[PDB]
Amino acid sequence: VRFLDGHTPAYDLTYNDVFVVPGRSDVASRFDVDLSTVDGSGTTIPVVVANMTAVAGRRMAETVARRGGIVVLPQDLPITAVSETVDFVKSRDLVVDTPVTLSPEDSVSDANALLHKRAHGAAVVVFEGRPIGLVTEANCAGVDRFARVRDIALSDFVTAPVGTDPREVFDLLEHAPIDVAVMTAPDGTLAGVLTRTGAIRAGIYTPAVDAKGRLRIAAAVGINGDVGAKAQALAEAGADLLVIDTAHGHQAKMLDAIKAVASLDLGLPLVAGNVVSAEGTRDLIEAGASIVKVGVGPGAMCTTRMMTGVGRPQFSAVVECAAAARQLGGHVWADGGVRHPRDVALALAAGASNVMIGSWFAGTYESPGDLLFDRDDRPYKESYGMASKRAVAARTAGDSSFDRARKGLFEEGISTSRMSLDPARGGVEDLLDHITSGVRSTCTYVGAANLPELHEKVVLGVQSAAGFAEGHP
Amino acid sequence: VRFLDGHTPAYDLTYNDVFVVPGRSDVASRFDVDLSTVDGSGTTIPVVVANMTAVAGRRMAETVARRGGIVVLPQDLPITAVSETVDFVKSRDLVVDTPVTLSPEDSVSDANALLHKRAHGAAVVVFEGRPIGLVTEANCAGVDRFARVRDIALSDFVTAPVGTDPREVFDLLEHAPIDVAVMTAPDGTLAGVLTRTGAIRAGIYTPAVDAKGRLRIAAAVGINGDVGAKAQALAEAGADLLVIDTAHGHQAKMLDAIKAVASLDLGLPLVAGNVVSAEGTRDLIEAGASIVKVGVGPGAMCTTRMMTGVGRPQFSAVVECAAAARQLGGHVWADGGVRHPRDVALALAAGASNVMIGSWFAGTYESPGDLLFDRDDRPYKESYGMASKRAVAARTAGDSSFDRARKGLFEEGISTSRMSLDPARGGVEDLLDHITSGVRSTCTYVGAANLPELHEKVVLGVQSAAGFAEGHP
Amino acid sequence: VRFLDGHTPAYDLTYNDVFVVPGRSDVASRFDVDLSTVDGSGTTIPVVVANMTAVAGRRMAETVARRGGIVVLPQDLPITAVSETVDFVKSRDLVVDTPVTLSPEDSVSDANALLHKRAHGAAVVVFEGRPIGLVTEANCAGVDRFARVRDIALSDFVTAPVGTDPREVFDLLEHAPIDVAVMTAPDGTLAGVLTRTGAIRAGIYTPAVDAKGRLRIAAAVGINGDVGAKAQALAEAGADLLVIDTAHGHQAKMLDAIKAVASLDLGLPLVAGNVVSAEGTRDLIEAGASIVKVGVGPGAMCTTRMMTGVGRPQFSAVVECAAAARQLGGHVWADGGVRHPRDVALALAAGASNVMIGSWFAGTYESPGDLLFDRDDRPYKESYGMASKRAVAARTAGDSSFDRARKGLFEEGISTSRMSLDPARGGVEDLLDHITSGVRSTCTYVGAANLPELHEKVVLGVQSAAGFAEGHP
Amino acid sequence: VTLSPEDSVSDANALLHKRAHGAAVVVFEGRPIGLVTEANCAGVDRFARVRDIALSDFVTAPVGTDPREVFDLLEHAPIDVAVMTAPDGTLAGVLTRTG
Ligand SMILES: NC(=O)c1ccc[n+]([C@@H]2O[C@H](COP(=O)([O-])OP(=O)(O)OC[C@H]3O[C@@H](n4cnc5c(N)ncnc54)[C@H](OP(=O)(O)O)[C@@H]3O)[C@@H](O)[C@H]2O)c1
Ligand SMILES: NC(=O)c1ccc[n+]([C@@H]2O[C@H](COP(=O)([O-])OP(=O)(O)OC[C@H]3O[C@@H](n4cnc5c(N)ncnc54)[C@H](OP(=O)(O)O)[C@@H]3O)[C@@H](O)[C@H]2O)c1
Ligand SMILES: *c1nc2c(ncn2[C@@H]2O[C@H](COP(=O)(O)O)[C@@H](O)[C@H]2O)c(=O)[nH]1
Ligand SMILES: *c1nc2c(ncn2[C@@H]2O[C@H](COP(=O)(O)O)[C@@H](O)[C@H]2O)c(=O)[nH]1
Ligand SMILES: *c1nc2c(ncn2[C@@H]2O[C@H](COP(=O)(O)O)[C@@H](O)[C@H]2O)c(=O)[nH]1
Ligand SMILES: O=c1[nH]cnc2c1ncn2[C@@H]1O[C@H](COP(=O)(O)O)[C@@H](O)[C@H]1O
Ligand SMILES: O=c1[nH]cnc2c1ncn2[C@@H]1O[C@H](COP(=O)(O)O)[C@@H](O)[C@H]1O
Ligand SMILES: O=c1[nH]cnc2c1ncn2[C@@H]1O[C@H](COP(=O)(O)O)[C@@H](O)[C@H]1O
Numbered sequence A, B, C: 001v002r003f004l005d006g007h008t009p010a011y012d013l014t015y016n017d018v019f020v021v022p023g024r025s026d027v028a029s030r031f032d033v034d035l036s037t038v039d040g041s042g043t044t045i046p047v048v049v050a051n052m053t054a055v056a057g058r059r060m061a062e063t064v065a066r067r068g069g070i071v072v073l074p075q076d077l078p079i080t081a082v083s084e085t086v087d088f089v090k091s092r093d094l095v096v097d098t099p100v101t102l103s104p105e106d107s108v109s110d111a112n113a114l115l116h117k118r119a120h121g122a123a124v125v126v127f128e129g130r131p132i133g134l135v136t137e138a139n140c141a142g143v144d145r146f147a148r149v150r151d152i153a154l155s156d157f158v159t160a161p162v163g164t165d166p167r168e169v170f171d172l173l174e175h176a177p178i179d180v181a182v183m184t185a186p187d188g189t190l191a192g193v194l195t196r197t198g199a200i201r202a203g204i205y206t207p208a209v210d211a212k213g214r215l216r217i218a219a220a221v222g223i224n225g226d227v228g229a230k231a232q233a234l235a236e237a238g239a240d241l242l243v244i245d246t247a248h249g250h251q252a253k254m255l256d257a258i259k260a261v262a263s264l265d266l267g268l269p270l271v272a273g274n275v276v277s278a279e280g281t282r283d284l285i286e287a288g289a290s291i292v293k294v295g296v297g298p299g300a301m302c303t304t305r306m307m308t309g310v311g312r313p314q315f316s317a318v319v320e321c322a323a324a325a326r327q328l329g330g331h332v333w334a335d336g337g338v339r340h341p342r343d344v345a346l347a348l349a350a351g352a353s354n355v356m357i358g359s360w361f362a363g364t365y366e367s368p369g370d371l372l373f374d375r376d377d378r379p380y381k382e383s384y385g386m387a388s389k390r391a392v393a394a395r396t397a398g399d400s401s402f403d404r405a406r407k408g409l410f411e412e413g414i415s416t417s418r419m420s421l422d423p424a425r426g427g428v429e430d431l432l433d434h435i436t437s438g439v440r441s442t443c444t445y446v447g448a449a450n451l452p453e454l455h456e457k458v459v460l461g462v463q464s465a466a467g468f469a470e471g472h473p
Numbered sequence D: 001v002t003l004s005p006e007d008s009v010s011d012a013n014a015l016l017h018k019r020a021h022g023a024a025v026v027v028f029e030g031r032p033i034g035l036v037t038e039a040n041c042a043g044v045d046r047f048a049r050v051r052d053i054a055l056s057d058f059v060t061a062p063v064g065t066d067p068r069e070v071f072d073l074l075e076h077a078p079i080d081v082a083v084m085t086a087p088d089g090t091l092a093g094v095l096t097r098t099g
């Protein structure tokens, strides 16, 4: 990477410490930028969802992969639950989304709460697999909780066959009272739904798909136990990518874990982390990893810095690690600390091939957690670290009370945090729009038409805290 | 520019990061400083009003130009509205201001709200072009909103012929109940008003006028569409200066737009921006621009930094760009981030020939927005960026709903902001006093009698955030 | 001054940016340190009170000079009021203080208000010059405001002859209900008062006195008008030191004012400021000044930095100017920005001979302003700059309304500020105890027995914002 | 309320509320010379003298004047207080429009 003349600080840099200076550009439109990655992950946008139980569920996996990202299932997930989630994701349609479905015998109480598991603003009343009505939040307003869905469902709705041009579906819904088109199979059974915004995103995002045309999904594994047997079971379950994840990725047990998985020859991309040094990046690649996950400390749920003093400013860590992996034909994932789209753009400019986002996506409809409200009726969801006392409790529940007490000495993560939803744009696809629009604008500012050209052409500068304050938050 | 020995930091600088060291001075008075610019804009004070719809209206254009600045009309303005605004500004008197005028049949409701479109504190009642009374806010206190103006108008007021020396008018109003002198034409028709403060400003500020002696006004044009045909229509409408404006001014489309306007040979100063690099400055000047607008990110309504990471600390950007423009005989406008008079002074010390100010002037009586009040009865006006959802909607309202949806992906500006009016000095001329008094003191501190000597003689230093905190805000 | 190895930052330093590293010391006690100055001011502590109308009154001048400092009377004071203040100060006792005095005919309303003009907690009731009672705040609690002093005054009080050993007076008051000994002349007339703390301070602070044994006092003069005639009148009125003062001290009008005063050969130390550059220090000294006042911007009432961007971090300014002055046999006063005793200590370590303090001392009983209370009953007093709209209004009240309106364009100071009094230690002598105890501890940490050894032996270091945060606020 | 020119502003401000006139009369040798209102003491140092803030101009009339005429003399007066004087010029008291 190139920095402005004289910008050689005597310290390491975070995303807040740096800026991109624009260059000469011939890219006429921000829609001309190709956001596809080149690390073998198969993503068409540089966004990976972290293997955190508060974020990485089946609804998130379907929604993100349709728009070009990928979700890493957490390592604490049982293999049967993994197999059920993968089979659900890989049976999803590439354009039409899975709606909330309700039986006419369901209670209005259930209908009100289930509505927010998706961002469509409406649920489809189904009977024997066929749509018979719609339910919105307005239909549940004032009704007793224990009335049935059949008493409140709207009986008329827009229907269209699966395979219809999304541009046409956009025009069908211009003057419809509900911005939902119920997509049906030739026999009349429910195939899914498609909103006006969903139709727009169909011509903007390319789905991340496997060799069979099914949505991609990844899975994580720990370094304890039989790593090889666990990795092979995840591969046979249908995972398209494997993440061997641990806090201190530069230890001997991680090196042995990588070799055990690589020697099985699963034919899948192997991600291993986390490290923040050039030496650790080389050692993980030499062990058999093709992608190195970079980040020790920056996660919004992490207390590692305050507990140990161990960490590294994430921008400088990605710059050094991406350069070391580039020498060996490897790639780097920037993992942790993403708060605004500039953090995504700056990580990619630093040399990362993908960016892993965690806590930010917990505050969305699609995340696994229940939607909550504070005293001011502001919507929010919980997030927590995978090394907190809450996560360790659910992961080690099978141990004796003696071992659980001794292990309770260590906690390097928060057990609860409030992640607010934007009152208007509360879906993960709204955040993807936010992130990708910013990255696309970064590329045209530097004159790049794709992500390799971004890292090649970017010129960076160092600023003080006053520099970061320039502009509006 | 000269910096103190050893002040060569490994980062770029904002206005907050630097300070001016005083030098030996023989300038006896701060009124002896010449504030005229030498970039061909014609401004006698180094203030340009940004081409933002929330700031640049006809009341702003008249008021600022009389005091020596210039207003750039936004590019979203229809050519008919531009012609009507230019003809209004170029028919204004050089000393006597345009008051709020009222018909005696107007409602007290209308009279109360219209008062705050000027800073005179009084409106003139007019019948067939001739003044017959005055209305103040004290006259509207308690009266029914739908009583007529004639029921509360003050029948006696100070009058004087247009052309009277402003110093005499100052003396006529010393003991008058209302500090407004109604200036009249030989036939008795209204020519305008002149307050005590307005008479003082006539001896301090030189109006910015064209070759016919009429107040100057500028106009902005985008890089899309037929830039040549638009620029020529703006020239024939009477614009004294043309601004070709876009966020990423260092792209091929901007370079072609400059050449298309330059080859038309309109005989007007040609401004193009925005860039923050020396290379960008040279490319714009070589394409045909005489003035380069500098600034990517620092605007108070901008979110470009947080969306993309793209931007440059404005002080270092002005320093590098002004030196590159100077090499080619061109000039540089410092655009964005002005919060206090020190920002204007430091930008001129960095080598800029003019300073463009936007959001700061939205919180004045003369800006186009309506005057609003919060729950605490504090006066304020709205401000918003020209690339926000609000501005883009008005600029693309005639496109199809499909295209407006796709274009909705990008938003690099805030759509609403509260800019407070100083409860005492709420007029834009009060801010011009504040700004120019600071620049004049800077010039005497360094020993400069004019703006070229300011950039020539200034010595600068770098400070930490503790240095900026010294003093009171 | 010596800095630690490698501590050569690329920016200028404030008091917050630096620290002192202790060295080997044989100074057994902090009471062994000699705080006397060597600049010819005659002060025995390194404290000078600023020539600000909100701080520099006759009660302040008496109290500080008895403890070793000196007060500079403001330049706006008429020569008649100057002569009266000097004659009051030079007739004061060197040990015994001047109390608030009351007539028995005075109202309780006046007694409770007058009580806070001194820090004694008691006023002396006087009749024909002799004491007849005491009045405390508890004696006025609940009494009608227009009852007379004779109705509430305490009739018995401790009395002692003037010249008594303060050590004994400390013992006389050990068991007295009111901590004040009324000091009397041989004929029984009131000579003043002395408290337990006041007797302690007599053995700690050496009074600053002239050649005849009378308390010292200084006076300021501006650079406009007949500077030579104004300086001579101040010399004949009894001033012990002259201060030629202006914001921009490095201008031609100041250099002529110094030469005009030096040519009169008044035999007094001549102070001139303000500058922040070595070149300005040399020019003022060569013009005839023996002491250069350093500081442009750091004053708590100043807005110069925000209006103009002109200034310099005060520590670096003092280091440079003190070094240039010492080459020419001159001295430097550190003027502005003192908030804590460390600021005084660091200014002396930087090479200043004396430290000027302004607004900090406004929040004391002895300052000329009236004592005020907020809604929470917190004691405070007003402070304001000598270049604010309030100050220039009184200074130019005799000019025409036209000129005062034109000069209203410039305002480089705030016109009102709330300076809180410490509810326990509200006297200026308490702040003197606070400041000088800190400076004495600084000298023993460095190994210095006097102020010249402090500057000679001190080793300094540079810190970040985190370094300044170490310790308790 | 009567005030000497040597009285303090602090005393003058507090004494004004012993009557409903809203103004006090400054007196030197029994003669009315100035008026003190609450607006005169607003912002002034509490221990300045009354002689610094007194209004030297006030409506005056001899005692025994018809109240109806005194009422009309005060219609446009800034202070609604008329100073009534004895034949020798000394102060006889005051008379407001409502009085
Ligand atoms: N000075 C600044 O930092 C700044 C920042 C934002 C906005 N603005 C203000 O916004 C107004 C104009 O709106 P605009 O900036 O959107 O320009 P515009 O003139 O309305 O359109 C810009 C054109 O350039 C293309 N473009 C390519 N890369 C771009 C990029 N990185 N950012 C923006 N457009 C890009 C756009 O196509 P696509 O849209 O299809 O990509 C579009 O065709 C002006 O008043 C300008 O001052 C200024
Ligand atoms: N130490 C500081 O940083 C600082 C800052 C502000 C004020 N002050 C305080 O203000 C008081 C004196 O008021 P003053 O400084 O306005 O001086 P002053 O003695 O009242 O007047 C200064 C004279 O110098 C001229 N001048 C030229 N350049 C000037 C500049 N940059 N700033 C001010 N005057 C300039 C003024 O003419 P024009 O007015 O016509 O230009 C005027 O004739 C002192 O008590 C001083 O301590 C100090
Ligand atoms: C520290 N870090 C933790 C913990 N659980 C997960 N993580 C890391 O944070 C990343 C997410 O960062 P965000 O800022 O939330 O996007 C994860 O990918 C993982 O690397 C924990 O308990 N402590
Ligand atoms: C970013 N920048 C924007 C937008 N509209 C205008 N601008 C820029 O800001 C300047 C004004 O800055 P202030 O800090 O308000 O004085 C304008 O002149 C223009 O360059 C926007 O939506 N985003
Ligand atoms: C700026 N500086 C001003 C003004 N009046 C006085 N001063 C300066 O400040 C010093 C006092 O500083 P503190 O921090 O209050 O102790 C004075 O000695 C003088 O140099 C003013 O209006 N603006
Ligand atoms: O569309 C739906 N209809 C009915 N129940 C649902 C629907 N989506 C989720 N649920 C229920 O909510 C549980 C949790 O879903 P998750 O949050 O998507 O894992 C499921 O196991 C179901 O019981
Ligand atoms: O002096 C005035 N008298 C009456 N109406 C006015 C006056 N100034 C502005 N208006 C009204 O306010 C509208 C907006 O004015 P603007 O804010 O100056 O563009 C005008 O089109 C008029 O309808
Ligand atoms: O001891 C005192 N007794 C009575 N009045 C005092 C005393 N000290 C100050 N004053 C009054 O307060 C005014 C202002 O005093 P200063 O605040 O010390 O300048 C004086 O002019 C007196 O009117």
Ligand SMILES: O=c1[nH]cnc2c1ncn2[C@@H]1O[C@H](COP(=O)(O)O)[C@@H](O)[C@H]1O
Binding pocket: C146, D001, D002, D003, D015, D018
């Ligand atoms: O007009 C006045 N001038 C001066 N002092 C007054 C005046 N009226 C009352 N006082 C004072 O206030 C005290 C109490 O007055 P009373 O409340 O009327 O009894 C008197 O004894 C005087 O000291």
